[PDB]
């Protein structure tokens, strides 16, 4: 299958040929969304979403499909980003398995997979492609565009690109290009996948595949992006309660073990090197011929308002490049709440500790109501 | 070649029967050492150094080999760890790869390597043998003790063992048993070996074997013994200078330079071990157990300590050096504790001896 599509699944096709920004063009491709609530009359209460690497459309649960959303505990009734005042539109990012184009589909002209044949992944495609779904769906400005991680990243090749469709955004642990170190963790991570003799160079197809790396690939990620401080408390040196060669043996590493089995199982290896490559490719100040590099960009977006958060323990995105999108926001007129979380769960933070997220989110998104 | 001996190595032959903690015993095996500085007539200077994961012997350069040592800064005339005043014993601890036995090095009884037949190693032994080398070059008790890293565990341990063979303790980034994160890293370090085709469970022979896998493990252990912080503002997003999905950032080409120095000089089922006995190490455990870690360091005779740790050390936090000092100084040695402000994090005590220089060459002053 090597695609993971939510069973409510909706779809837009993207008309004809699809350019790229590194060249090459799709056709036959499509992004499938979700929505959360209510449109209104005058459409003027959407809120786009646009996902961290490993997520799909299906950001919270609905009737059609009870299961809990990758955002359950932010997006829904009374929720932080209330679905009784917002219609909330999630989407696939172009590249990834879970419903929207990717290597894993099927390319016309041959009737098999892409592949490597997939054309090389953008940041500003994906943004492209969700900009498209947004105007398909019948709305030409957002009330607010949320992007958290890589959808950081997505969200502000948005607002450069389309800048009037969104009258705000909010910011979640992003960054407008990545620094060294979450360079490379990633290029780690897509070398556990490359180095899985399983890969046949992005023909493993129906076999098990280089399911080894993707394990890996998990565990890393996992590990960085909570603080070492956090792992220490929670797990302590307790061994694994079930009780043949250097196995595992403490908790923690069952743990670890655990999730990376989860992903593993629900995600194509070929589409995350796209996308984890994309993370590494962008970079909001390289183009267009404005001038002023990043903090340039940023000031010529037209937002209204903006949020803007951080966790003070990430260490894939730290804070600092969180401050440095609300300060640029900001030099352009935008009206910007920064807030840096003190949370021990570094870059899962905005996953993991809505407790803390969710409040900040709430508070803005009742100022722009 | 499967071990990496350093030219100018001694030894010290270990007793037949050398017993290993969780099983097992040592036949034909021995402990591979250097020397810096002369002992005196009295034979009350000498200090003993055990080693990270990774070091050897070679602790600095000498005639026999002017190659630079892996604390060539910190050992020498004049310098922090004086050997115009000491005589500096560095010892490659057991189970590693550079002189000293391990599953590199052949087995008396079958004439070939011991590979994965080596018997499961803990810190504990690496003690003993360290206890043994000291005792047979006719040294009765050490002016000072030195650990750093893997060998702060392996010095606690002697000094709980053999109380009687250290005056001081010096422990640079140590810790009393390792940290669930510190377990993790490892246990990821040691499945990029043992997942390289070219591992074999553990019966490669010449050439490459499971290369990849060893540079890998090098790659994720510098991404950690260093803040992330410090990574970003060293390479920025600049390119590789020289000309699907490979390698493209600066910061890749730098990591893949220095694992591979690592690769070449290194035997994976050494790594293997040694990596394993970091995790399963824990002070509580000895004496009985009484009071756990910090009843064992309270039991402990030194008289005098300098205990220093990174303050972004993340593989043996700070706390785990304060842990330490509290620890011999609730038992009534005489203990300096020193929270090193550096960006270099677990290496620090390796590359940033502007601070840690000075501390050490003033603790020993005293102890002189």
Redesign the interface.
């Given at each position: 299958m090597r695609e993971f599509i939510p069973p409510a699944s909706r779809f837009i096709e993207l008309p004809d040929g699809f350019a790229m920004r590194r060249g090459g063009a799709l056709y036959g491709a499509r992004i499938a969304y979700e929505t959360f609530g209510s449109l209104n009359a005058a459409r003027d209460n959407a809120v786009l979403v646009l996902t961290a690497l490993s997520g799909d459309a299906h950001a919270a649960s609905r009737p059609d499909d009870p299961t809990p959303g990758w955002w359950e505990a932010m997006v829904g009734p009374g929720k932080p980003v209330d679905t009784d005042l917002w219609h909330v539109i999630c989407v696939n990012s172009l590249g990834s398995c879970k419903g929207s184009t990717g290597p894993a589909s099927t390319d016309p002209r041959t009737g098999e997979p892409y592949r490597?044949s997939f054309p090389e992944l953008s940041i500003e495609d994906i943004a492209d492609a969700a900009a498209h779904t947004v105007r398909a769906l019948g709305i030409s400005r957002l009330a607010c565009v949320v992007g958290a991680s890589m959808g950081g990243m997505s969200a502000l090749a948005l607002l450069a690109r389309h800048p009037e469709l969104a009258r705000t955004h909010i910011s979640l642990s992003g960054a407008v290009?990545?620094?060294?170190?979450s360079?490379?963790?990633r290029?780690?991570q897509?070398?556990?996948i490359?180095?899985?003799?399983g890969w046949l160079?992005?023909h493993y197809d129906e076999g098990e595949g280089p399911r080894?790396?993707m394990l890996?690939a998990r565990?890393?990620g996992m590990?960085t992006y909570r603080s070492?401080?956090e792992?220490?408390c929670?797990?302590?040196?307790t061994r694994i309660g079930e009780r043949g060669?250097?196995g595992?043996?403490?908790e923690?590493?069952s743990y670890?073990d655990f999730h990376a089995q989860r992903f593993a199982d629900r995600f194509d290896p070929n589409s995350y090197?796209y996308l984890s490559?994309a993370m590494?490719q962008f970079?909001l100040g390289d183009g267009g011929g404005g001038g002023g590099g990043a903090p340039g960009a940023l000031s010529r977006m037209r937002v209204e308002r903006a949020l803007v958060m951080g966790a003070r323990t990430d260490?894939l995105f730290?804070l600092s490049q969180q401050q440095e999108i609300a300060d640029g926001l900001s030099a352009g007129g935008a009206d910007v709440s920064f807030l840096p979380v003190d949370t021990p769960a570094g870059h899962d933070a905005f996953l993991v500790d809505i407790e803390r997220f969710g409040p900040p989110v709430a508070k803005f998104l009742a100022i722009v109501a």
């Amino acid at each position: 299958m090597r695609e993971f599509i939510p069973p409510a699944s909706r779809f837009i096709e993207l008309p004809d040929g699809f350019a790229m920004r590194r060249g090459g063009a799709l056709y036959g491709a499509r992004i499938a969304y979700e929505t959360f609530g209510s449109l209104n009359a005058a459409r003027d209460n959407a809120v786009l979403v646009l996902t961290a690497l490993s997520g799909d459309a299906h950001a919270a649960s609905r009737p059609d499909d009870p299961t809990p959303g990758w955002w359950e505990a932010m997006v829904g009734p009374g929720k932080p980003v209330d679905t009784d005042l917002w219609h909330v539109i999630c989407v696939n990012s172009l590249g990834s398995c879970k419903g929207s184009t990717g290597p894993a589909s099927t390319d016309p002209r041959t009737g098999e997979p892409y592949r490597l044949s997939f054309p090389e992944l953008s940041i500003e495609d994906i943004a492209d492609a969700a900009a498209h779904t947004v105007r398909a769906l019948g709305i030409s400005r957002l009330a607010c565009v949320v992007g958290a991680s890589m959808g950081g990243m997505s969200a502000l090749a948005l607002l450069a690109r389309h800048p009037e469709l969104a009258r705000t955004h909010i910011s979640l642990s992003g960054a407008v290009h990545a620094l060294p170190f979450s360079i490379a963790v990633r290029s780690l991570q897509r070398e556990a996948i490359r180095s899985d003799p399983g890969w046949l160079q992005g023909h493993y197809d129906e076999g098990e595949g280089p399911r080894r790396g993707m394990l890996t690939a998990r565990k890393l990620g996992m590990m960085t992006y909570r603080s070492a401080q956090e792992w220490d408390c929670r797990f302590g040196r307790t061994r694994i309660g079930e009780r043949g060669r250097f196995g595992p043996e403490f908790e923690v590493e069952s743990y670890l073990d655990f999730h990376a089995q989860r992903f593993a199982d629900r995600f194509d290896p070929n589409s995350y090197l796209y996308l984890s490559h994309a993370m590494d490719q962008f970079d909001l100040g390289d183009g267009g011929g404005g001038g002023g590099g990043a903090p340039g960009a940023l000031s010529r977006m037209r937002v209204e308002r903006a949020l803007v958060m951080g966790a003070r323990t990430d260490i894939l995105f730290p804070l600092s490049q969180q401050q440095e999108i609300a300060d640029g926001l900001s030099a352009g007129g935008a009206d910007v709440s920064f807030l840096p979380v003190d949370t021990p769960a570094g870059h899962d933070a905005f996953l993991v500790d809505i407790e803390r997220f969710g409040p900040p989110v709430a508070k803005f998104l009742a100022i722009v109501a």
